[PDB]
Design a protein around this ligand. Structure first.
Ligand SMILES: Nc1ncnc2c1ncn2[C@@H]1O[C@H](COP(=O)(O)OP(=O)(O)OP(O)(O)=S)[C@@H](O)[C@H]1O
Ligand SMILES: Nc1ncnc2c1ncn2[C@@H]1O[C@H](COP(=O)(O)OP(=O)(O)OP(O)(O)=S)[C@@H](O)[C@H]1O
Ligand SMILES: Nc1ncnc2c1ncn2[C@@H]1O[C@H](COP(=O)(O)OP(=O)(O)OP(O)(O)=S)[C@@H](O)[C@H]1O
Ligand SMILES: Nc1ncnc2c1ncn2[C@@H]1O[C@H](COP(=O)(O)OP(=O)(O)OP(O)(O)=S)[C@@H](O)[C@H]1O
Ligand SMILES: Nc1ncnc2c1ncn2[C@@H]1O[C@H](COP(=O)(O)OP(=O)(O)O)[C@@H](O)[C@H]1O
Ligand SMILES: [Mg+2]
Ligand SMILES: [Mg+2]
Ligand SMILES: [Mg+2]
Lengths: 332, 318, 339, 325, 474
């Protein structure tokens, strides 16, 4: 109530207010003034402004009071393709438009069709090739269904045929930095030089992750009570990133080549608590990007890191996997 | 109009005509001759002749009293708790005068689809009225019938029909139907049957109706499955490019899904003999890994290509 | 009963080592209005569950330690009696995924729905790493849909198998292993409350170095050595290691000295004896590998092969049902390499 | 009128069902002979199974088709109970009819449960004399052998280009559209034997045109309307991996994936398909490339970090094609 | 852009498939080595026994006639017999005795025992009147309360040796058998005849009835009888019929039917008819199995790696079916529990989907369903091929299980808790809160160390009773 996560507290309420993404907001305002959209799909990195954009379209389309009744976000969730999604969709088709508001008239076209939001519903245990095709044909004039997706790997061409596919472009670092700095200024987040760039670097363009990390860092800074500017080390610790000093020690040890030294260092490093997956990712960043290594070395280390990461993802012991990876890199 | 299928036109009306499982069929014949039919659960794969065995046993046991002494309940009929508590119990309590030793038969075909509570209610019904009626189940899977029901019946596990019995009855049908047969065609019919006798009869009927003379090529035209020789050439080719071309053209572009290709490859490899047993088992392991990856969700063309590459490595090397 | 239980810090102030984490948890409990979903990760025996329990006590009260056992029985498709001990409390609930195998999704969602049926109730999840991907997705759905009434605190020894969304919607808290001095201080406190007659303080340091940053192992070794010598620890007093570790050492010795099929049959019998005593195969493989790597008659190439086969067979163990096959295959490959 | 081209260009008779010819010839022989056994039309979606059965049912049953044919769909909210109820009520009624052989078209039977399939087999066996079933499915491995043995299976293959292009010519002239040869080739190679996809993409391309009267549709229009990797993009990624530096290859891969919204699985599959056309001097190159890329795809399906997977793809291709050199 | 790949184009040769019948002849299935059905002798029927030419089932033909022939331990037989006589004598007097017996357990003669006791008490079959309430009828309050009250209140028209037996008191439907336990309680209040309850488990019986029966020492457990006595009884039964059989096949019959006298008797009723056909394979013999050494360690390494990969394949594919298997309607699924929780449904709808009352929730995964028999299973083929040439694979298939190593874990934890509590409750909850892996790896072995240390000093002469934990790990 009094507290609100900054991910949803600073969500763009106006459609045109959505930062950057002109190619989407312009066409979307045209479609909104068209008083009817076809069922549309957007693709981009999760957290680039998909849900914010669709909610803002509904904001400038329907009324705020009409909102929580007309929109049912039956997304990839407790709701099941037909067990609940289809049942609730048809029971909502049994429901008509509620009382028209005041400012809603003329200002908010409030088209009769309803909007149903399904975020990443392709990742569901129900494969509805035509279970919702029939329900958006029988209820085309009284509802529409909008979907959220990551890539252009669309599953079924039916139910995804008449789609105005909007490419939510990757959010540029400048505008993302501007938005995060604006949020920090509103929330009086005392940060020195380098916090926001580091947050964007770990979040890799994900503003949602960036905003949550900034909120967590601010909460930790208030917890300490020092009142000092947040450091990049705290942000790194709040995300699981191994410190660069440890990674440099790791690469020096694997340059040394001795099996015993590497084994002892890995034994002492497993007690620190830093995960092996972050070590593998930062080793990839240090080795593939570096221009001081031959093409053969990078080619071999790519497969080595890939195998290590694939084994680590399958729930295996981190000690053995990291020791094997570091030894194999040493033999390279 | 319609022509009677050879599956139905040449259905055994007596227990002696039924081939396969000689011991069980002979014992069922002896039971039908003498009487005192025990409760039985005939189980096994599809198409080996379970329902035919039950119906022939009931007919031979009863005779003219078959109409009023046998109650058949398939999955199409309702077999709920109410049905078991009323209809089956009233049939068991019915007073029918039969020759001594003979008993009324309650044929519950496809008992694996019956609900558990109906099976529990059937247990007391069969235990109480066993002096007048005897029950006979017929399920594809024997584990779907509750242990209380299985402890009051003689479980019959029919086995897959061997090549010899299928060949014998097929020769009988070909001889009474004036069918031109070739050794390769009949061998193809056995191979596509895989112990399913109904499948063998249907394939023979389809081949005769469509392409007349039963050659192996004619049999492999009405099975709508990957051609075993094509799959064998794909797996056993010494050039990987040729195997990839075969998989792309004759299998992937023709609409054969990954499951059918994997099944045909596994069957061919299991039937392969020129390669060693260790090589056979290792290729079978690669096919199993590919089938596993398909079951997880990764059933793309690249997985089958990698399977072919591994099989090529295993064949050319080692 | 055990000193690992009686001398368990039951308050945030009672926490001795990792003072930064203690301050962070105290500040988190300073406002009990909002607990973000916590993912406490680190080495085993580092006080992760102790700190979670202390934080829950500080928010609610000393009741969070009054635990009741509610046994839940479930039946799957193949009719197996899936029996679970669901440790509950008037304020919190505790569950453990591994105790239900592959089927850890339906049971987890049923228990979480039962919790949500009735400010908030915190659900503690031990070994969140062992959760399958579908169960982790169900947890991700729960953390967003059931955020108002359920706060999931997950304790895992490794966060790497956890999916990205769960990490993204959780406060990642790391628990580093206590240093040798901190373990020695804790053991000295246990000693001075239990009146242990040491001849010197070096014994505690030896215990700490033998336990390798594991507080539970160090405390149990203290208790065992104290009760063996009747509260009379000495320099000559050997470190009490569990029997399975000694059996693994003997197995490694046999593997190094005897490379034969009959030796492999004997190794299989030893593995069967170890697994029959309810010892998880992952730990058995870990100790076997790290004891084979410490053999002083082996060069670099053999040890690299040992670590490679250990990684491969650990991955196979994580994805397999019968562990004896994986362990025997690892032993056979090791013996083939050692030739 | 205001209808999708899917329903507008439906085959109203058996002569308009292109591509599948063996099935149509057998069905025409069936109707001419009068022997119509239980049919099972299965294959990839959009091959023309429903079109075939609808055309045949209309051709046999004239005007009474509305009452003599019941079209079911097991995927709906009925379950075994209501589905069985409807089938037995339609099959055992023997309503006032001109002739007989009431036809039941059960669509999406691969979603029917095992008990439901056995019950359907029993119902088919009981009411064979008056009711003929033409159970429809998409995959034959999801159907029980009991149902598979009571029906004459008729596999549908993906339509051949010669047909897809004929229906292209038919729809284009009637709807007054222009397809450039490269765009037509792209649509034909992108449909993969799916006429429904062709019609949907064609209608979307019509709607896309600023003046949908004489504006020719280009290759890029179809490749962006369908949402598929362009051959140029995959070829550029492949050549950057093959002949450029590791940093440049990584930059090109990331840029293409971000700009085209292309997942790594599609990139791997397209690279494999393109490299199939090209010849390799060695064979270990092909073996290692296929095996490593399949392993990468399998690991991608389970999950991980995409940067390491992309680096693994680049390294696998580079190592495989340095083996040949 | 063209962006040409630096690779020459490939001209694909045109593939043709002209297969000679010689290649078709190679499709013949090679003779399988894994399959090995070994037959037994035909049964040798001796003489013309009147029992052989019977019209009743063999389990009922050999129905017990006294209390000596029932397959139950004599102690419990005597206890039940004395309880029934005492109940008859007490209820004869005007009436602290609630007539109730719970005859729980997993034995077979849980109903013929009561009938034989009645036959012995009355001396005649017609005298005793046992009213069996079986599951084949509707055991609901509004259908049976009046009938049972009238039966247990007045005298039968004919010593009134009357009894009510509730067979299968564990399987009860939620709506069909409504108010059943209320009926049992009301009968217990207003009965003058004994009330026997039989079940396979005691969990379904309400705790009130359990406590009431345990107070009167009327809770009797039927333990399963060892296979030796079942085998001896079967040999005597076949001697009565004068049928020769090899003792190996009879041993196999006893073993495979879980020592069930009724199941074994039905199996012998089938497989002992006067026919020349050979007997069932029963325990399948070894498929020319040679568990050899394997010579070089490389071969056994390959075999073990193949075994590990096959185990991975089995774990990955043995529970992923492609055909959507259905969920049983008469099961206590959570959806069914919540459905009956809603009061919108009337009595008629609840009759359609009535579920059997249970204490264990029946959860199911619609996606991860077990493989059907007709689906492809390469894991089974690899397992049967490897077992046919290596016996230790077949041994490993059953050396360890899932119920095993978990019940052992439970017993080990119980012993550890007992040893800890015997210190010269808090553990019961906190150690349980400690993760199962931690108890398996660290707590239990160290508790064993402490137990063996305290057992050492006891032999020399801070905890007592250490021999149990010493025995558990041994
Ligand atoms: N263009 C943007 N301008 C301002 N804030 C943004 C923008 N894009 C994202 N955000 C912030 O990030 C949050 C999530 O953005 P969205 O992408 O709309 O949500 P989302 O699609 O649900 O994210 P995922 O896919 O579930 S991780 C918003 O609530 C904002 O706080
Ligand atoms: N051993 C056999 N000898 C002769 N005909 C057989 C034999 N087995 C099967 N058939 C024929 O094949 C068909 C099998 O029919 P059923 O016995 O009903 O099949 P099933 O064994 O019950 O398996 P289902 O129907 O899948 S549960 C009949 O037409 C039989 O005539
Ligand atoms: N062989 C064909 N000849 C002509 N039009 C075809 C052919 N195959 C498909 N089509 C067209 O493509 C669409 C396919 O419609 P349907 O036949 O209903 O789909 P289907 O082949 O039954 O597959 P689904 O996805 O399981 S409904 C229709 O618009 C048809 O006009
Ligand atoms: N020596 C014996 N002792 C006991 N029962 C015997 C003996 N010989 C044969 N039987 C048969 O074993 C069966 C035991 O009685 P049942 O009523 O069928 O079983 P039950 O008591 O209901 O227990 P269940 O079946 O596990 S619920 C009867 O059919 C008896 O004829
Ligand atoms: N701050 C601390 N001070 C003293 N002892 C501690 C502290 N933290 C943990 N311990 C010891 O650790 C034991 C519990 O470890 P636990 O938290 O269960 O390990 P894990 O987190 O690996 O499950 C207790 O017996 C307690 O004595
Ligand atoms: Mg979203
Ligand atoms: Mg049948
Ligand atoms: Mg259709």
């Amino acid at each position: 109530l009094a507290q609100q996560p900054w991910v949803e507290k600073y969500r763009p309420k106006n459609l045109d207010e959505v930062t950057a993404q002109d190619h989407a907001v312009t066409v979307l305002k045209k479609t909104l003034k068209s008083a009817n959209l076809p069922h549309m799909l957007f693709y981009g990195p999760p957290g680039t402004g998909k849900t914010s954009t669709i909610l803002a379209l509904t904001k400038e389309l329907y009324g705020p009071d009409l909102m929580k009744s007309r929109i049912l976000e039956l997304n990839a969730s407790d709701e099941r393709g037909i067990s609940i999604v289809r049942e609730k969709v048809k029971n909502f088709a049994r429901l008509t438009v509620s009382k028209p508001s005041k400012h809603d008239l003329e200002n908010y076209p409030c088209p009769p069709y309803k909007i149903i939001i399904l975020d990443e519903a392709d990742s569901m245990t129900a494969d509805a090739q035509s279970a919702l095709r029939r329900t958006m044909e029988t209820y085309s004039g009284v509802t529409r269904f909008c979907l959220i997706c990551n890539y252009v790997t669309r599953i079924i061409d039916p139910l995804a045929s008449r789609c105005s596919k909007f490419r939510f472009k990757a959010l540029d670092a400048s505008n993302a930095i501007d938005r995060l700095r604006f949020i920090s200024e509103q929330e009086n987040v005392k940060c020195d030089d380098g916090v926001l760039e580091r947050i964007l670097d770990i979040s890799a363009g994900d503003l949602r992750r960036g905003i949550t990390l900034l909120q967590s860092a601010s909460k930790g800074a208030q917890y300490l009570g020092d009142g000092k500017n947040i450091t990049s080390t705290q942000v790194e610790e709040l995300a699981g990133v191994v410190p660069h000093d440890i990674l440099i020690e790791i690469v020096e040890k694997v340059k040394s080549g001795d099996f015993d030294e590497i084994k002892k260092y890995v034994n002492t490093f497993m007690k620190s608590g830093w995960s092996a997956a972050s070590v593998v990712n930062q080793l990839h960043e240090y080795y593939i990007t570096n221009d001081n290594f031959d093409t053969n070395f990078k080619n071999q280390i790519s497969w080595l890191l890939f195998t290590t990461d694939s084994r680590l993802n399958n729930g295996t012991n981190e000690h053995i996997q990291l020791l094997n990876l570091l030894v194999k890199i040493s033999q390279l | 109009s319609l022509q009677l299928p050879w599956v139905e036109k040449y259905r055994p009306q007596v227990l002696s005509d039924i081939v396969g499982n000689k011991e069980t069929i002979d014992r069922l014949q002896q039971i039908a001759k003498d009487g005192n039919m025990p409760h039985m659960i005939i189980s096994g794969m599809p198409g080996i002749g379970k329902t035919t065995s039950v119906h022939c046993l009931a007919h031979e046991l009863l005779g003219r009293s078959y109409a009023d002494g046998v109650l058949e309940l398939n999955a199409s009929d309702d077999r709920g708790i109410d049905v078991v508590r009323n209809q089956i119990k009233h049939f068991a309590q019915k007073k029918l005068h039969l020759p001594p030793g003979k008993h009324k038969i309650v044929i519950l075909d496809e008992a694996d689809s019956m609900t558990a509570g109906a099976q529990q209610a059937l247990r007391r019904t069969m235990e109480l009225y066993s002096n007048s009626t005897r029950f006979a189940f017929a399920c594809n899977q024997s584990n779907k019938i509750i242990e209380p029901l299985q402890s009051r019946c003689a479980i019959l596990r029919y086995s897959k029909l061997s090549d010899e019995d299928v060949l014998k009855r097929l020769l009988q049908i070909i001889k009474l139907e004036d069918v031109k047969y070739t050794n390769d065609g009949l061998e193809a019919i056995i191979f596509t049957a895989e112990g399913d006798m109904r499948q063998a009869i249907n394939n023979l009927q389809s081949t005769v109706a469509g392409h007349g003379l039963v050659n192996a090529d004619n049999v492999f035209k009405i099975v709508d499955s990957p051609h075993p020789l094509i799959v064998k050439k794909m797996l056993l080719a010494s050039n990987l490019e040729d195997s990839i071309q075969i998989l792309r053209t004759d299998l992937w572009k023709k609409g054969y899904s990954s499951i059918d290709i994997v099944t045909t490859s596994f069957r061919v490899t299991k039937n392969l003999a020129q390669v060693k047993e260790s090589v056979r088992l290792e290729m079978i392991k690669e096919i199993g890994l590919t089938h596993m990856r398909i079951l997880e969700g990764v059933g793309t063309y690249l997985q089958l290509a990698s399977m072919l590459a591994k099989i090529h490595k295993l064949n050319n090397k080692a | 009963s055990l000193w690992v239980d009686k001398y368990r810090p039951k308050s945030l102030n009672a926490l001795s080592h990792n003072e930064e984490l203690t301050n962070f948890l105290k500040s988190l409990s300073d406002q009990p209005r909002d607990l973000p979903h916590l993912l406490l990760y680190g080495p085993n025996g580092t006080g992760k569950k102790t700190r979670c329990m202390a934080l829950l006590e500080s928010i609610f009260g000393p009741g969070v330690y009054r635990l009741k056992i509610d046994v839940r029985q479930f039946v799957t498709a193949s009719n197996r009696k899936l029996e679970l001990n669901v440790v509950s409390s008037p304020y919190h609930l505790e569950i453990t995924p591994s105790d239900m195998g592959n089927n850890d999704r339906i049971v987890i969602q049923e228990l979480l729905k039962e919790v949500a049926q009735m400010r908030y109730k915190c659900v503690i999840i031990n070994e969140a790493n062992s959760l399958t991907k579908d169960a982790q997705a169900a947890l991700r759905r729960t953390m967003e849909k059931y955020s108002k009434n359920i706060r999931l605190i997950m304790v895992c020894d490794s966060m790497s198998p956890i999916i990205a969304p769960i990490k993204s919607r959780c406060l990642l808290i790391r628990c580093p292993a206590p240093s040798d001095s901190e373990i020695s201080t804790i053991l000295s406190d246990v000693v001075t409350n239990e009146r242990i007659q040491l001849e010197t303080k070096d014994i505690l340091k030896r215990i700490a170095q033998a336990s390798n940053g594991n507080l539970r192992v160090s405390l149990l070794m203290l208790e065992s050595m104290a009760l063996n010598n009747e509260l009379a620890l000495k320099s000559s007093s050997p470190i009490i290691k569990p029997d399975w570790i000694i059996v693994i050492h003997k197995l490694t010795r046999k593997i190094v000295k005897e490379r034969s099929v009959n030796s492999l049959i004997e190794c299989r019998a030893v593995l069967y004896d170890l697994l029959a005593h309810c010892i998880p195969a992952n730990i058995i493989l870990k100790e076997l590998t790290f004891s084979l790597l410490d053999v002083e008659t082996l060069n670099t190439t053999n040890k690299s092969s040992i670590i490679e086969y250990s990684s491969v067979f650990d991955e196979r163990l994580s994805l397999g049902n019968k562990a004896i096959f994986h362990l025997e295959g690892f032993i056979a490959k090791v013996m083939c390499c050692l030739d | 009128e205001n209808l999708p081209w899917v329903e507008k260009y439906r085959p109203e008779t058996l002569d308009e069902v292109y591509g599948q010819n063996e099935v149509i010839t057998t069905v025409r022989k069936f109707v001419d002979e009068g022997k119509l056994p239980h049919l099972l039309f299965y294959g990839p979606p959009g091959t023309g199974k429903t079109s075939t059965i609808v055309a045949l049912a209309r051709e046999i049953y004239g005007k009474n088709y509305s009452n003599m044919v019941l079209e079911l769909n097991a995927s709906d909210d009925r379950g075994i109970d209501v589905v069985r109820n409807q089938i037995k009520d339609f099959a055992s009624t023997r309503q006032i009819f001109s002739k007989g052989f009431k036809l039941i078209i059960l669509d999406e039977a691969d979603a029917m449960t095992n008990a439901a399939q056995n019950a359907l087999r029993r119902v088919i066996e009981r009411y064979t004399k008056n009711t003929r079933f033409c159970v429809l499915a998409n995959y034959a491995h999801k159907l029980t052998p009991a149902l598979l043995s009571r029906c004459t299976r008729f596999r549908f293959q993906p339509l051949p280009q010669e047909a897809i292009e004929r229906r292209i010519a038919n729809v284009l002239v009637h709807e007054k559209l222009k397809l450039s040869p490269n765009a037509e080739k792209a649509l034909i190679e992108l449909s993969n034997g799916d006429m429904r996809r062709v019609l949907n993409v064609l209608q979307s391309c019509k709607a896309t045109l600023d003046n949908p009267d004489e504006d020719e549709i280009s290759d890029d229009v179809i490749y962006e309307c369908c949402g598929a990797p362009r051959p140029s993009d995959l070829k550029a990624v492949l050549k950057s991996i093959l002949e450029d530096d590791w940093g440049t290859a990584h930059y090109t891969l990331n840029k293409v994936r971000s700009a085209k919204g292309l997942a790594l699985i599609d990139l791997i599959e397209g690279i494999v398909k393109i490299l199939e056309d090209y010849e390799l001097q060695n064979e270990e190159t092909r073996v290692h490339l296929l095996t490593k890329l399949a392993d990468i795809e399998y690991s991608i399906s389970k999950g991980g970090n995409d940067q390491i997977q992309g680096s693994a793809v680049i390294g696998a291709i580079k190592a495989s094609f340095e083996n040949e050199t | 852009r063209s962006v040409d790949i630096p690779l020459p184009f490939r001209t694909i040769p045109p593939l043709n498939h002209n297969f000679l019948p010689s290649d078709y002849e190679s499709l013949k299935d090679k003779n399988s080595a894994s399959c090995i059905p070994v037959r037994y002798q035909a049964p040798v029927l001796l003489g013309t026994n009147i029992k052989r030419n019977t019209t009743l089932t063999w389990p009922q033909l050999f129905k017990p006639v006294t209390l000596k022939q029932v397959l139950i331990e004599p102690k419990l037989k005597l206890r039940i017999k004395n309880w029934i006589e005492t109940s008859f004598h007490t209820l004869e007097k005007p009436t602290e005795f609630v007539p109730l017996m719970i005859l729980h357990g997993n034995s077979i003669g849980k109903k013929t025992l009561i009938q034989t006791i009645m036959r012995e008490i009355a001396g005649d079959d017609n005298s005793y009147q046992i009213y069996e309430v079986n599951s084949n009828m509707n055991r609901s309050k509004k259908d049976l309360l009046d009938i049972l009250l009238d039966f247990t209140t007045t005298h039968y028209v004919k010593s009134d040796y009357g009894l009510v037996l509730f067979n299968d008191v564990d399987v009860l439907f939620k709506e069909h058998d409504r108010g059943y336990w209320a009926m049992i309680s009301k009968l217990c209040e207003f009965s003058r005849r004994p009330l026997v309850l039989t079940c396979k488990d005691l969990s379904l019986v309400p705790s009130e009835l359990i406590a009431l029966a345990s107070e009167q020492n009327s809770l009797f457990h039927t333990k399963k009888i060892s296979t030796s006595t079942v085998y001896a009884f079967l040999t005597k039964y076949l001697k009565s019929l004068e049928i020769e059989v090899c003792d190996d096949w009879l041993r196999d019959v006893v073993k495979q039917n879980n020592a069930d006298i009724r199941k074994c008797l039905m199996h012998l009723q089938f497989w002992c008819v006067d026919t020349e056909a050979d007997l069932i394979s029963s325990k399948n013999r070894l498929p020319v199995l040679t568990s050899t050494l394997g010579s070089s360690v490389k071969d056994i390494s390959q075999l073990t790696d193949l075994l590990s990969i096959n185990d991975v394949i089995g774990q990955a594919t043995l529970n992923r079916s492609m055909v959507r298997q259905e969920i049983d309607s008469t099961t206590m699924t959570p959806e069914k529990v919540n459905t009956f929780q809603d009061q919108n449904l009337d009595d008629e709808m609840k009759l359609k989907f009535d579920y059997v009352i249970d204490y264990k929730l029946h959860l199911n995964d619609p996606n991860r369903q077990p493989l059907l028999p007709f689906e492809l299973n390469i894991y089974q083929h690899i397992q049967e091929q490897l077992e046919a040439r290596y016996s230790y694979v077949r041994e490993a298939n059953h050396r360890l299980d899932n119920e095993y190593l978990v019940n052992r874990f439970k017993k080990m934890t119980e012993s550890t808790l007992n040893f800890l509590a015997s210190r010269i409750e808090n553990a019961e909850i906190d150690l349980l809160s400690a993760t199962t892996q931690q108890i398996k790896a660290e707590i239990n072995p160290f508790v064993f160390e402490i137990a063996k240390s305290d057992a050492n000093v006891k032999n020399e002469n801070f905890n007592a009773d250490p021999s149990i934990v010493v025995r558990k790990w041994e």
